Amino acid sequence: GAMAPSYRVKRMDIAKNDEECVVNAANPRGLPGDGVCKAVYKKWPESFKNSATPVGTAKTVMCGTYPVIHAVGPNFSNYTESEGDRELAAAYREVAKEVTRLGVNSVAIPLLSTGVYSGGKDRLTQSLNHLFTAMDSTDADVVIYCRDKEWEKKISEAIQMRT
Ligand SMILES: [Cl-]
Ligand SMILES: [Cl-]
Ligand SMILES: [Cl-]
Fold first, then answer.
1. With left for phi above 0 and alpha for psi between -120 and 50, is residue 28 left, alpha or beta?
2. Which amino acid positions bind ADP-D-ribose, per UniProt?
């Protein structure tokens, strides 16, 4: 575990993370995809061997000795608000189980279902709160990656609000 388990946020490409493993915002089919998923495919393409997994789950595949945890959030274009919320919570719970199993001291994680799976809504608070519900009981250092300056400020404020 980390000596003083923490949450942090950085505004940069998660493919350039400084953590012991990465969470991919995957599609269920293990396809290269776009956004975070395409960056992850370019950096760790070996991790997409048999990475297909259903919505609400996470599947880890090693790239060398570096673990890539493929976490499949719901596409809110297809799910109801109610069912989508349940599957988004479940995907983060499966990430917490994998991070624990791997014995890593740190993990890089994007906000699931906030980009092309958002169904055109702002889901920063929804997705971040499900991330906290899952990861709070883990002792890995968690580093959240985002691309937008306003999102960085809101995620940083939400972390600091608990501290
Ligand atoms: Cl960058
Ligand atoms: Cl997304
Ligand atoms: Cl962002």
1. alpha
2. 13, 27, 35, 115-117
